[PDB]
Subunit: 193 residues, 4 copies
């Protein structure tokens, strides 16, 4: 399938830039008999570095030469039940500070990463700024109060987000947060898209 | 500002397609003295139908000739407090069936429409299928249980989404929902993006 | 239509953001009957400044509320004959320096602007220089020798013989004339 | 590098989806030390089928995990001389029918494929016919008269004199030869 996608896209690119199995095979340094096979679905074992070259000689990226993520939907929908949520914990010196509960995700939209974040630290100073995402983010406060921080990791703007507050964080905009001072814990839904 | 954006974009388009104030003015049927002014920021009062023509003669859309939505962010973020949420009610014969609570929205990402939907009907048959959105949707069950319906408005797939369930609805995929049978009401967060 | 296109797109945006006729009308300082009319194809007279504000309250752009360029094709294609082509003169002091021949253009791809540029100046120092555009550009030398100048007035220079082709990335400023004392040159430039 | 590019992009995707070395390793039936190595630039030998599965568990594509085409420019531009151009022959029975001259191409825009096509067939019935491509195409008649055929073998036909230009939308199938008995024609085609 990844092999079949490569086959169709290799052939198409080869054709759009006017190269016969001969030229491509030469330019790359293989036997026309080889490229032929690649286009016959036999690319399976080619390596990431080999694909690197093949894409070069064709003035393109490996991405243009490989099939799209795929379709994991059922009539346009995909459902995640709470009992099948993957869980990861942000621990520090063996103590939970955050727990990320991963919600439904789909290959038909890879930028979509929805999480339920349980914040187990109510000390604003424990907030550790993270560079910034390569995509926008939607936030929603489920429980407690959230002390949000954003901007210059050194000199940052602050906000006290009570339950029910919603926020929008532009991509590449650095941010960090804990639960409001002395309130114990908080809960927010974060949707990176 | 909408007038200033039009000015810069009118001039740029005019130039990229090689037309002097003369040709454009003729082709459109105005005085070169007029187009000149338009490009001087004086387009303000032009009508939607006039802009329609101007964009035609330049082989483009009014969209390419008008500035982008704008920037309403504060250092890459925008915050909506719960007390400023706009509320709309889906009523039927004077009785609330749904209440939409609008969450933060931003011009820097117009496709983003997050809502908290209180479903006040627990009768699956009241589910009224809506064509489908021109964008994807992320759903999350906040309270109660949701009886989701999707696909053929006539013969549809059904799902019983307990609290904590998350769902993904591809765009143009028709859907509708009520709270699970006899449970009174439910709550879900819907994020159209 | 601009009118019908607005009508359809306005209703969708409004319904999309959970605003009823009145909510929208309130924010706009209009009456709900007015808005309803707009969604009934009567927005034709709305000005650019009004649309600007409508888009603002709907948290989007005028473009997102207006219809696409349109379609001028014919089974996926459009053809322009050498007769039906506009001609623009890049004139200085009545002295023709550049003469652009506009090739086929289409709404289905507004960004495509193909041209045959006759350069009537063989004085490299006459190279005016623009500040690049928000599009890429492909060039091909048809006749003569081209004197290419890119980067920014201060710049790399190339003498392109006939049959030469080059790619100029968006926002990269450029200028050109025909090679020193050769009189004139010709090149086709396709901005996309 | 493909290796380094993978390394950087894999780590971001993993961190992006809240998977630690072990979680990823579990789904892949690999060990956490392996994955860590990959994020350390040692993914070079991973096959296309393996990358395919890695992308699958990371709910994305191989492309989203691999680096962009790369950059071959030079201050926003790249130049090709008539000497440095590849030539491909569309041959049938040793009889040259079409000869394509490849013009300047760039990774910064892979989709751009400019060509000078010498058509050595004046027999319209020789018009082969392709099934359109996933890109748009601009054409210009350099020499001779072109016999255009579009739609699908069953089709609109146009006789393009010299200087004619046309736009062919993506997926719209086309074919062509030189006008009846005129020997040969020339046209530049730029797919983008
Ligand atoms: Fe984040
Ligand atoms: Fe919906
Ligand atoms: Fe240019
Ligand atoms: Fe073609």
């Amino acid at each position: 399938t990844a092999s079949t996608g490569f086959a169709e896209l290799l052939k198409d690119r080869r054709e759009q830039v006017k190269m016969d199995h001969a030229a491509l095979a030469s330019l790359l340094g293989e036997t026309p008999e080889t490229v032929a096979a690649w286009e016959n679905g036999e690319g399976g074992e080619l390596t990431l570095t080999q694909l690197g070259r093949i894409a070069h000689v064709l003035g393109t990226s490996i991405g243009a030469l490989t099939p799209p993520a795929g379709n994991d939907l059922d009539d346009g929908v995909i459902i995640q039940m709470p009992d099948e949520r993957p869980i990861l914990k942000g621990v520090r010196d063996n103590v939970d500070y955050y727990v990320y509960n991963c919600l439904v995700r789909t290959k038909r939209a890879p930028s979509l990463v929805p999480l339920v974040v349980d914040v187990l630290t109510d000390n604003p100073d424990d907030a550790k700024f993270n560079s910034g995402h390569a995509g926008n983010e939607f936030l929603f406060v489920l429980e407690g109060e959230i002390h949000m921080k954003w901007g210059d990791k050194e000199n940052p703007k602050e906000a006290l987000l009570p339950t029910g507050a919603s926020m929008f964080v532009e991509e590449h905009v650095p941010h960090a947060f804990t639960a409001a001072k002395g309130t114990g814990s908080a809960k927010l839904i974060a949707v990176n898209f």
